[PDB]
Design a protein around this motif. Sequence first.
Motif, PDB file in Angstrom:
ATOM      1  N   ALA A  73       0.812  -1.214   0.000  1.00 54.27           N
ATOM      2  CA  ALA A  73       0.000   0.000   0.000  1.00 54.27           C
ATOM      3  C   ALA A  73       0.849   1.269   0.000  1.00 54.27           C
ATOM      4  O   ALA A  73       1.834   1.389   0.731  1.00 54.27           O
ATOM      5  N   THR A  74       0.458   2.222  -0.830  1.00 48.32           N
ATOM      6  CA  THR A  74       1.099   3.523  -0.854  1.00 48.32           C
ATOM      7  C   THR A  74       0.028   4.599  -0.853  1.00 48.32           C
ATOM      8  O   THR A  74      -1.152   4.336  -1.090  1.00 48.32           O
ATOM      9  N   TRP A  75       0.451   5.825  -0.597  1.00 47.99           N
ATOM     10  CA  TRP A  75      -0.473   6.946  -0.598  1.00 47.99           C
ATOM     11  C   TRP A  75       0.243   8.198  -1.076  1.00 47.99           C
ATOM     12  O   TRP A  75       1.466   8.310  -0.984  1.00 47.99           O
ATOM     13  N   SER A  76      -0.544   9.144  -1.569  1.00 48.74           N
ATOM     14  CA  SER A  76      -0.012  10.382  -2.103  1.00 48.74           C
ATOM     15  C   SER A  76      -1.160  11.365  -2.186  1.00 48.74           C
ATOM     16  O   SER A  76      -2.198  11.072  -2.790  1.00 48.74           O
ATOM     17  N   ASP A  81      -4.072  24.051  -0.838  1.00 46.63           N
ATOM     18  CA  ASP A  81      -3.085  25.113  -0.702  1.00 46.63           C
ATOM     19  C   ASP A  81      -1.781  24.781  -1.428  1.00 46.63           C
ATOM     20  O   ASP A  81      -0.812  25.534  -1.345  1.00 46.63           O
ATOM     21  N   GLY A  82      -1.755  23.653  -2.133  1.00 48.72           N
ATOM     22  CA  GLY A  82      -0.602  23.286  -2.935  1.00 48.72           C
ATOM     23  C   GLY A  82       0.418  22.429  -2.209  1.00 48.72           C
ATOM     24  O   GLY A  82       1.426  22.025  -2.794  1.00 48.72           O
ATOM     25  N   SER A  83       0.168  22.155  -0.933  1.00 47.28           N
ATOM     26  CA  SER A  83       1.046  21.276  -0.164  1.00 47.28           C
ATOM     27  C   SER A  83       0.756  19.814  -0.505  1.00 47.28           C
ATOM     28  O   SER A  83      -0.266  19.502  -1.113  1.00 47.28           O
ATOM     29  N   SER A  84       1.659  18.923  -0.111  1.00 47.35           N
ATOM     30  CA  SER A  84       1.536  17.508  -0.454  1.00 47.35           C
ATOM     31  C   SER A  84       2.403  16.627   0.436  1.00 47.35           C
ATOM     32  O   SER A  84       3.316  17.114   1.110  1.00 47.35           O
ATOM     33  N   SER A  85       2.113  15.329   0.415  1.00 45.17           N
ATOM     34  CA  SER A  85       2.879  14.338   1.151  1.00 45.17           C
ATOM     35  C   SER A  85       2.576  12.963   0.570  1.00 45.17           C
ATOM     36  O   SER A  85       1.583  12.778  -0.148  1.00 45.17           O
ATOM     37  N   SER A  86       3.440  11.996   0.847  1.00 47.12           N
ATOM     38  CA  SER A  86       3.256  10.656   0.308  1.00 47.12           C
ATOM     39  C   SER A  86       4.073   9.662   1.112  1.00 47.12           C
ATOM     40  O   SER A  86       4.996  10.041   1.822  1.00 47.12           O
ATOM     41  N   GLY A  87       3.750   8.381   0.987  1.00 43.58           N
ATOM     42  CA  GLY A  87       4.503   7.355   1.679  1.00 43.58           C
ATOM     43  C   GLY A  87       3.886   5.976   1.606  1.00 43.58           C
ATOM     44  O   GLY A  87       3.223   5.636   0.621  1.00 43.58           O
TER      45      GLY A  87
END
Length: 330
Positions: A73-76, A81-87
């Motif tokens: 499993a992954t996420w993104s 507001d243009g911010s982001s994260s993933s893992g």
Amino acid sequence: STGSATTTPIDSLDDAYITPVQIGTPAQTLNLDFDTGSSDLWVFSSETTASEVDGQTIYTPSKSTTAKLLSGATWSISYGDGSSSSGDVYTDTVSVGGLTVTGQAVESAKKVSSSFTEDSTIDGLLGLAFSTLNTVSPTQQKTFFDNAKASLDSPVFTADLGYHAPGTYNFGFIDTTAYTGSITYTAVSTKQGFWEWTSTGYAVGSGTFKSTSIDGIADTGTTLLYLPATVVSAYWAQVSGAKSSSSVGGYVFPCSATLPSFTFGVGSARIVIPGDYIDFGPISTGSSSCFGGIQSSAGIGINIFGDVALKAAFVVFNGATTPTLGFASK
């Protein structure tokens, strides 16, 4: 079951609110931004790129006896507001204010964008929109609320955000001492995965109420109130010297102003946002130009009842089979 947790502004402007959350065994307490506009529970972690961590508390799954990697499993995610994260993703035990969910998907960040790194007070997000927005692939995961719902005394949570003060998130019950008058309930569309509803109109200061339908979302993870350009222009026209600044990125006003209140309709009821709630202070340190708390939604594509609006009310997120939203004055 029920839960009850205090939520605390991160700074003197109420830019966001953090709520302590226990993850794992033994508990690791992280301060998360509860966000009714998204549906991922993600955290800074021992897996987060080291240079992208600056003061946050991290989740270390290897120190939790109940953590299990959710294989493959992954996420993104990318926010408005243009911010982001993933893992990647673990399941673990998560508790909020005494309410415990086992097997909750805890999305561990490998990468975060600069705005997250730069905010040392926010250790992650806890999404409370509908699980259809959850970004985990290839198997979408449920929100903390969705997982807790069947166990709750009532399938609800409430947001009681403070103005320059702590407030409360409750799960599973309505605290009848936390609001004045009655709660007015209004229909929700889940078609876009949000707590989307239609306000019945607005007033500026002591002016007459304009009856007009304003479709928007109740979003605890957005700081400001974003409304149609017509509505916003009518508000700022009542503030001497206020103007929209393309260089700053919205309406600004002289810090010497006294701001009028803003009222929004919920059915036949009315929620009044005091003028002071609309002041977001100098645009830069020492400036006498102040940033407004009501801004245009034009080009966002949706109206957003963010913290500026929600903190003026006691708000019920009713997750019954047909969801609804309730608002009371307080």
